[PDB]
């Protein structure tokens, strides 16, 4: 229930092109507010030599990727960061390095 603005890895409204400069090594990640899909949040990660951008789905009052839903984004991100569960089956992405704001 801790706020996004107090998380080291939350970068607010930085655009995709700026996230590119910040994501450089396997498992680097940050969260930002989408421009292409206004009102949505994005988990941006560096994995296998590429930047990958996942919409954090918000459905029925829950934030999720492909599995468990949580009431808030910090709980979802912390879950993946501590358990190393992949973001999606297709991507196999594992969060390793929170990129500080």
């Amino acid at each position: 229930s801790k706020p996004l603005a107090e998380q080291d890895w939350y970068h607010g409204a930085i655009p995709r092109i700026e996230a590119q400069e910040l994501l450089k090594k396997q498992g680097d990640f940050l969260v930002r507010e989408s421009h292409g899909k206004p009102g949505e949040y994005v988990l941006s990660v560096y994995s296998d030599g590429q930047r990958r951008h996942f919409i954090i789905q918000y459905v029925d009052n829950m934030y999720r990727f492909e599995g468990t839903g949580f009431s808030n984004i910090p709980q979802l991100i912390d879950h993946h960061y501590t358990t190393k569960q992949v973001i999606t089956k297709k991507s196999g992405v594992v969060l390793l390095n929170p990129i500080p704001k």
């Binding site: 292409g36 919409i55 492909e66």
Partner: peptide, 6 residues
């Protein structure tokens, strides 16, 4: 721009 899951 492309998003992985949307």
């Amino acid at each position: 721009d492309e998003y992985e899951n949307v």
